[PDB]
Amino acid sequence: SSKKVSDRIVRLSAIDFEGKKHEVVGLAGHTLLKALINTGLIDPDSHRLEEIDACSAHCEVNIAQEWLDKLPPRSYDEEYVLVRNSRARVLNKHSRLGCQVLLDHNLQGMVVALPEPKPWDT
Amino acid sequence: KVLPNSASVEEARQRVFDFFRATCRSLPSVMEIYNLYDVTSVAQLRSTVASEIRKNIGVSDPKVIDMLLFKGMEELMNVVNHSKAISPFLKNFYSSNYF
């Protein structure tokens, strides 16, 4: 009952666009977007407010099908954002927004993929 | 880049593994270089490279191993740059005197 932080630590992995393997550490209850931003493979200024309204699919991550069964399914707003903010207006069926991925020990060890970054300045 | 001589059998083995990796990654380029797709069998080519490495096990000198790897890398670069029942005795006997 020491109430440390190592219990809340959730360790997962991320392969970015060019294929480099990365180790991502994030607290339980803090989103995958926040964990990736802290790791440094997502531009912090690109995505600041962890909200669906402020998300423009700049937090999109592709997750394996055997990991999609461990987190809640995509909401209608998330699916709409993925459909609209894409190169082609299709659903990738393996990608979820990093804002709605609430990290937990169930998802500990999950492997995600960071697609090619998109511009966000104006 | 050329490296100093390997001072350990483990280092020589690691260099051999790196060279085999390089050959395997450079194999598909040889496909478009030579165009023998009918009877190439890329898997058979990999098996032949492994067989060459396995027939070169009698060597135990790390210096000889490093020299062999250097020459193998040179040969890889050259190939990338496109530079190409009557017993055995009786056949040679019928062929010529010098055998």
């Binding site: 020491s2 109430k3 440390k4 932080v5 190592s6 809340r8 630590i9 550490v25 607290l27 802290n38 | -």
Partner: protein, 210 residues
């Protein structure tokens, strides 16, 4: 044997500079924020609007970033520092979110204080520690590195220990305290003109010398 330097400044005719930029890192202070003249902000220090950095304290963010949020109060003679990496593998920059009151002799290093927090004096937060949102630590509490203070709780003791949960009425008073020290800081702020008159004194000294 040690060799004293003859050209060593035993009197600088000016105290410690309030802002010490290291390399390209310039400490940033919001115009609304109040930092006392006695403080020393060195390196990667970022003080946002409404902050109340009180006299006698020091913020040395040379190793890693130090951030003071909106209406955050850091009181007199406290020390704030950071370092590369932490025992928890989380980012080790010192972050203090909005509506956080921090007592007099607080020793903060690589802490991650979430918004709306109360921290008493003589409180020490070593590397990797985070005090979650809406939490209180009383005076003298020291948290070991990597220890966390859960949200909605009161903690105490030289080794940090949970005392009791916080009622909603007690929780709502943390922003009130933050804005109260903010108002006191605003009262302190009005006594300083944009430019000091000490340059007249140094010119008088130069004229006296020649």
């Amino acid at each position: 044997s040690i060799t004293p330097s003859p050209d060593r400044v035993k009197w600088d005719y000016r105290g410690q500079r309030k802002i010490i930029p290291l390399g390209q890192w310039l400490p940033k202070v919001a115009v609304d924020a109040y930092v006392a003249p006695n403080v020393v902000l060195a390196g990667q220090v970022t003080v946002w609007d409404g902050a109340s950095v009180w006299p006698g304290c020091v913020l040395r963010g040379d190793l890693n970033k130090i951030s003071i949020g909106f209406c955050s109060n850091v009181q007199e003679r406290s020390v704030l520092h950071a370092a590369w990496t932490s025992p928890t593998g989380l980012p080790a920059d010192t972050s203090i979110e909005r509506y956080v009151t921090i007592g007099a002799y607080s020793l903060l290093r690589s802490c991650t204080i979430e918004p709306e927090c109360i921290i008493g004096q003589h409180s020490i937060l070593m590397e990797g520690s985070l005090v979650e949102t809406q939490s209180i630590l009383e005076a003298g509490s020291v948290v070991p590195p990597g220890r966390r203070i859960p949200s909605g709780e009161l903690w105490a003791g030289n080794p940090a220990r949970f005392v009791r949960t916080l009622t909603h009425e007690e929780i709502l008073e943390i922003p009130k305290l933050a804005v109260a020290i903010n108002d006191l800081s605003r009262d302190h702020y009005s006594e300083f003109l944009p430019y000091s008159t000490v340059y007249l004194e140094v010119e008088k000294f130069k004229k006296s010398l020649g």
